Amino acid sequence: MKTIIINGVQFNTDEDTTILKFARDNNIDISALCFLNNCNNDINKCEICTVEVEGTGLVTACDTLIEDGMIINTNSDAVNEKIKSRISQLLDIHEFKCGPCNRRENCEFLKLVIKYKARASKPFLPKDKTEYVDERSKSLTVDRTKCLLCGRCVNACGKNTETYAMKFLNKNGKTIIGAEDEKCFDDTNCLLCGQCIIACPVAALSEKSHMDRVKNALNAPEKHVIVAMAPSVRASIGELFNMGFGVDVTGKIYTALRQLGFDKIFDINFGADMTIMEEATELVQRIENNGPFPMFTSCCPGWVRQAENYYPELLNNLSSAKSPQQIFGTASKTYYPSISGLDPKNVFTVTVMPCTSKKFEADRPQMEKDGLRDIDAVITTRELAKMIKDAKIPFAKLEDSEADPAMGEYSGAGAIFGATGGVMEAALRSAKDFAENAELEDIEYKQVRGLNGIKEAEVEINNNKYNVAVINGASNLFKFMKSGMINEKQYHFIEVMACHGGCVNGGGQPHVNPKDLEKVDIKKVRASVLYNQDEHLSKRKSHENTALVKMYQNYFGKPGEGRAHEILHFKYK
Numbered sequence: 183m184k185t186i187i188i189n190g191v192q193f194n195t196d197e198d199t200t201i202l203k204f205a206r207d208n209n210i211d212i213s214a215l216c217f218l219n220n221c222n223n224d225i226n227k228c229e230i231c232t233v234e235v236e237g238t239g240l241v242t243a244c245d246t247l248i249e250d251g252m253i254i255n256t257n258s259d260a261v262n263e264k265i266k267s268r269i270s271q272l273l274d275i276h277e278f279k280c281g282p283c284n285r286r287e288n289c290e291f292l293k294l295v296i297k298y299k300a301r302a303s304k305p306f307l308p309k310d311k312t313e314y315v316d317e318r319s320k321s322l323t324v325d326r327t328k329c330l331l332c333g334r335c336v337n338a339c340g341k342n343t344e345t346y347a348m349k350f351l352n353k354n355g356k357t358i359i360g361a362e363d364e365k366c367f368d369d370t371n372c373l374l375c376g377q378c379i380i381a382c383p384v385a386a387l388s389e390k391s392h393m394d395r396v397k398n399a400l401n402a403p404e405k406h407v408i409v410a411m412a413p414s415v416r417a418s419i420g421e422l423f424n425m426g427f428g429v430d431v432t433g434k435i436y437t438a439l440r441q442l443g444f445d446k447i448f449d450i451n452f453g454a455d456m457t458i459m460e461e462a463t464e465l466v467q468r469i470e471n472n473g474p475f476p477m478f479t480s481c482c483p484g485w486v487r488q489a490e491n492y493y494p495e496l497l498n499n500l501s502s503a504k505s506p507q508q509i510f511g512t513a514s515k516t517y518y519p520s521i522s523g524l525d526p527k528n529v530f531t532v533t534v535m536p537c538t539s540k541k542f543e544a545d546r547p548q549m550e551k552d553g554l555r556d557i558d559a560v561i562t563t564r565e566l567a568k569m570i571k572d573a574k575i576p577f578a579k580l581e582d583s584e585a586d587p588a589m590g591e592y593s594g595a596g597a598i599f600g601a602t603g604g605v606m607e608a609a610l611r612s613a614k615d616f617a618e619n620a621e622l623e624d625i626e627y628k629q630v631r632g633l634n635g636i637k638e639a640e641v642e643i644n645n646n647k648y649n650v651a652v653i654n655g656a657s658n659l660f661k662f663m664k665s666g667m668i669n670e671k672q673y674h675f676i677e678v679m680a681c682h683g684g685c686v687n688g689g690g691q692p693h694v695n696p697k698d699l700e701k702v703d704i705k706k707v708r709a710s711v712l713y714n715q716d717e718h719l720s721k722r723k724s725h726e727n728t729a730l731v732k733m734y735q736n737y738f739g740k741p742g743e744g745r746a747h748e749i750l751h752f753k754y755k
């Protein structure tokens with residue numbers, strides 16, 4: 183048992199950890215910036231975590247182990263002068279104009295400037311940001327006037343995806359971050375998954391705005407503007423309204439969307455029940471067809487890009503069912519006019535997504551029919567929050583309202599889509615019923631839930647055993663393939679999400695303070711809202727969705743055939 187003194191207080195512990203981790207395990211205030219995902223900016227360490235060790239001098243707390251006899255001072259003048267200097271030198275390369283900034287309310291660097299009363303040696307007042315801004319992508323943007331060069335996005339890309347699509351670059355003898363060869367991210371192997379945004383402590387990385395599309399549509403008197411939110415939005419957007427973590431705010435969202443002027447309040451969970459209808463039907467067809475196996479899910483656009491960029495040989499094995507977003511959009515321009523009288527050309531369909539990659543998917547040229555886009559605009563969870571705040575809507579106290587049912591009702595199978603393994607579980611609930619011509623009461627598939635990187639299970643379907651796998655994160659897709667794990671057995675159905683934890687941890691989600699991430703399992707607590715909804719919903723199978731059944735009976739017919747096969751499917755070449 184080593185004995186250490188921090189700020190004159192004695193500690194006796196048996197732990198082998200850093201000074202930073204021990205301090206925040208014992209409520210001792212140590213600042214940090216570049217340390218995230220268990221790694222600091224190995225090159226160009228920010229040194230904001232500086233503490234003093236007697237007999238040693240100034241050290242970085244985030245990567246220095248505690249030792250016996252250590253005497254630490256976290257708040258001496260020499261320490262605070264050094265930290266203040268590092269922040270001051272960051273201010274020298276930082277456009278400190280918080281008023282119109284999209285991180286004004288939850289910025290890690292503003293918090294540090296205030297804490298240490300840091301002050302630039304010369305204010306950075308760039309006069310034309312076009313040199314600093316890259317908005318070429320359909321999903322991501324870069325504003326380098328805010329970039330601290332802390333490396334958190336580069337480390338997060340490598341850790342979360344193993345593509346290293348975010349790189350340090352040498353541009354005119356100066357270090358920047360960007361895509362390979364400073365190209366548009368879309369034109370590289372980048373998945374557009376936005377995990378680099380999530381890792382960013384400032385507004386140097388953002389989603390590509392679709393707020394112009396939405397604003398103009400709401401202002402056009404002939405446009406009838408539909409809005410529909412992803413599963414995960416209702417389990418996360420309250421974090422940006424001081425409501426805490428894990429709060430179900432579904433009903434408040436419906437009310438806020440009406441107060442914003444949208445003409446119909448639907449739900450992408452209805453599209454999730456559609457995807458299950460088509461995809462579970464396809465799985466049964468492949469089973470009766472003895473292949474081809476495996477079938478991969480096709481609903482994650484980051485996974486689709488990963489397949490396109492790294493495993494093109496797998497593209498024909500992707501399910502032909504459109505993603506819940508695109509399958510909903512297709513039906514919004516065809517079935518919805520048939521029950522409303524709207525001119526299809528005047529319908530404007532907006533989705534709210536926890537995801538930046540969904541903007542690329544919606545803008546794919548072939549994602550349209552008769553000149554009408556499936557989906558006209560995609561705003562992130564963060565974008566909707568700003569929308570509500572700009573309209574001065576008191577979100578935290580809104581009364582609950584319901585969705586418009588026609589394309590708004592959803593089963594519990596659709597509700598869990600946002601968590602890793604949720605698509606797999608939802609698909610199995612319908613597929614087993616379909617294949618066995620039965621109504622089975624045992625529907626919970628806990629074996630595919632959870633935060634394990636690769637999850638596998640053996641399922642019995644119509645007196646035969648099948649192998650399924652759930653791949654939780656793009657880096658785990660690489661591991662699954664490169665290790666030969668896809669060859670330990672014959673796999674028949676495989677779910678892939680590019681974001682660890684599923685869509686609840688998507689690239690369009692609210693940022694979380696690094697000190698909140700050490701105390702809150704954000705993947706688990708956001709997902710728990712969705713699993714709770716499934717528990718309490720009166721329908722827990724996608725093919726039991728009353729409004730969906732009515733849509734197929736009156737308009738699309740039976741899944742996988744005819745009209746459904748005609749327009750609700752999409753294949754990648």
Ligand code: 402
Binds near residue numbers: 411413415
């Ligand atoms: N389309 C679609 Fe999906 C559905 O429903 C979302 O909206 Fe997802 C979420 N939340 C996102 O982004 S995509 C991948 N499959 C799981 S969930």
Ligand code: SF4
Binds near residue numbers: 276277286291385
């Ligand atoms: S990134 Fe932060 S410190 Fe910089 S202008 Fe925006 S809110 Fe202010």
Ligand code: SF4
Binds near residue numbers: 331333381382383387
């Ligand atoms: S873009 Fe953000 S995460 Fe990346 S180096 Fe700049 S400040 Fe750090």
Ligand code: SF4
Binds near residue numbers: 340345367374376
């Ligand atoms: S969007 Fe995803 S794949 Fe692309 S650079 Fe960012 S983290 Fe990497």
Ligand code: SF4
Binds near residue numbers: 481485539540684
């Ligand atoms: S897991 Fe979800 S949030 Fe992440 S890239 Fe895929 S669809 Fe988007």
Ligand code: FES
Binds near residue numbers: 213216228
């Ligand atoms: S947080 Fe320790 S060197 Fe950056």
